[PDB]
């Protein structure tokens, strides 16, 4: 979950310091990493 | 793409007010809708 | 000094949100209090 | 008034985020520069 771990850090870290770009890049990364986890076990 | 339009609208509209809680629930629907639409027209 | 305190609080609160009118007026009041600091009995 | 600009610049920026420590240092500059000007016209 290391790939997902880093993504969670950015979104929550951005959440505190009100931001738009940082939140945006993180959120897509999380879902992008989630779909990454969707197929990570298979390959 | 009629559906994707609403996602774009809400995200941009929310982003103006520098509101993050509603942006978060929107910026996800855009990616969810985008993949969903790609999955449509086939089934 | 009490005068600067209220202005500082107001500017900080305004900047915390994303409203510009309050920020501008509070900055004006900040500078006003800063100059008035000498403007009061000190030097008068 | 250039000196007081930076102190005001940091405070609003810190207040924009929630970096408490940055705010704490900055606010002292606001008061510190407040006397500095009144102590600057006299040389």
């Amino acid at each position: 979950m290391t790939g997902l771990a880093e993504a969670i850090a950015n979104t929550v870290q951005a959440a505190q310091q009100h931001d738009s770009v940082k939140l945006g890049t993180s959120i897509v990364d999380i879902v992008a990493n989630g779909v990454g986890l969707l197929g990570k076990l298979f390959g």
Side-chain angles (χ1 to χ4, degrees), chain A:
Chain A
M1 300 303 249
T2 60
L4 193 71
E6 307 288 350
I8 290 285
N10 292 119
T11 175
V12 68
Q13 188 274 331
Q16 285 183 170
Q17 57 194 57
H18 295 252
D19 183 309
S20 300
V21 65
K22 292 312 306 297
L23 191 159
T25 60
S26 199
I27 281 284
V28 175
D29 189 359
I30 297 169
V31 179
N33 265 7
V35 67
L37 185 144
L38 268 292
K40 182 54 175 59
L41 66 93
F42 305 91

